[PDB]
């Protein structure tokens, strides 16, 4: 009954992957309000659809800069995935379009902010708070992995909190739809699995490694491997020498011990029972997996929200002007967008 859902979710995703969507909107249809996020080739803005007064997050990619930073294939892949996926912890893409200068992606505004701000502010989450989030990530991965997607970019900076206090995943820049193995050095240091650092040729097991780092970081307040510099973090990672704070329950230690397992072939999520080893684990004994899927569980933390189009859970960034050029830029490279 979960396997039928996935087989039906798989066929849905494959249709929308081969026959998708293009120029569903235009830029003067929107009032630009404030920047919610920056990044190397783009920015994300809270916009207001003038026709309807509804608010969205608009992601604005500069075409020239995307070409400079050799990210064409990543931006195209993010868009493609986002219009083909359907799951309650994955953000919805409402419109995409482009002009002479820019690529645009219009998504649902998620007003609760990054988990990251929340976790640095409180310091750590208690085990049940941390478990609530974990459980959402465990189902999301189960979904994406059945589609053959590896996510690769899991960290609190990339998890947002909605109005109900549940998680939304945005950022499929690095996700890759493959069966078998892949070899790219990519990700964020604290969260890179050992096989990635050792240039081994790796698989979806990396994502469960990342879930362990995330569960640890959520319950501790800090990641399990850090240092001044990437290199010295990587040395700690491949050693597999985790120390756990004393407040960690023994049930958490046991799971964490099975996710941060250096060896691929005894890592939870990569064994024969698959994702079921994580779901039947004792740390998640009190966890109702269906009720989580249906969003029917009172969240233990709900972010403050003062009305539609409130940005109080986001940082302030330096507002820049939207430059639209009179000349078309990078038209061939971005035809499929």
């Amino acid at each position: 009954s979960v396997k039928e859902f996935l087989a039906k979710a798989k066929e849905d995703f494959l249709k929308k992957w081969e026959n998708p969507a293009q120029n569903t909107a235009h830029l003067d249809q929107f009032e630009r309000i404030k920047t919610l996020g920056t990044g190397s080739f783009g920015r994300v803005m809270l916009v207001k659809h003038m026709e309807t007064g509804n608010h969205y997050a608009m992601k604005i990619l500069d075409k020239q800069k995307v070409v400079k930073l050799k990210q064409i294939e990543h931006t195209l892949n993010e868009k493609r995935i986002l219009q083909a996926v359907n799951f309650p912890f994955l953000v919805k893409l409402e419109f995409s379009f482009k002009d002479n200068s820019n690529l645009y992606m219009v998504m649902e505004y998620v007003p609760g902010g990054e988990m990251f701000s929340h976790l640095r502010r409180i310091g750590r989450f208690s085990e049940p708070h941390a478990r609530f989030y974990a459980a959402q990530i465990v189902l999301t991965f189960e979904y994406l992995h059945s589609l053959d997607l590896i996510y690769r970019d899991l960290k609190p900076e990339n998890l947002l909190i909605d109005q109900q206090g549940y998680i939304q995943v945005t950022d499929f820049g690095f996700a890759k739809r493959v069966k078998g193995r892949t070899w790219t050095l990519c990700g964020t240091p604290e969260y890179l699995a050992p096989e990635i650092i050792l240039s081994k040729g790796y698989n979806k097991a990396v994502d469960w490694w990342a879930l362990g780092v995330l569960i640890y970081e959520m319950a501790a307040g800090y990641p399990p491997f850090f240092a001044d510099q990437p290199i010295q973090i990587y040395e700690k990672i491949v050693s597999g020498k985790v120390r756990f704070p004393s407040h960690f329950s023994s049930d958490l230690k046991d799971l964490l011990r099975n996710l941060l397992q250096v060896d691929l072939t005894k890592r939870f999520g990569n064994l024969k029972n698959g994702v079921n080893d994580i779901k039947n684990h004792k740390w998640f004994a009190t966890t109702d997996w269906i009720a989580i899927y249906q969003r029917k569980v009172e969240a233990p933390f709900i972010p403050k929200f003062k009305g539609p189009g409130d940005t109080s859970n986001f940082d302030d960034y330096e507002e820049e002007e939207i430059r639209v050029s009179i000349n078309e830029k990078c038209g061939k490279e971005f035809s499929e967008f």
């Binding site: 990251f116 640095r120 900076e157 690095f174 800090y222 850090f226 704070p245």
Partner: peptide
């Protein structure tokens, strides 16, 4: 402590990715 060691690394803020 471990907390204090983490502050001493300078990576308590938003962490960037690496690319190729």
């Amino acid at each position: 402590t471990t907390y204090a060691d983490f502050i001493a690394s300078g990576r308590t803020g938003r962490r960037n990715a690496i690319h190729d």
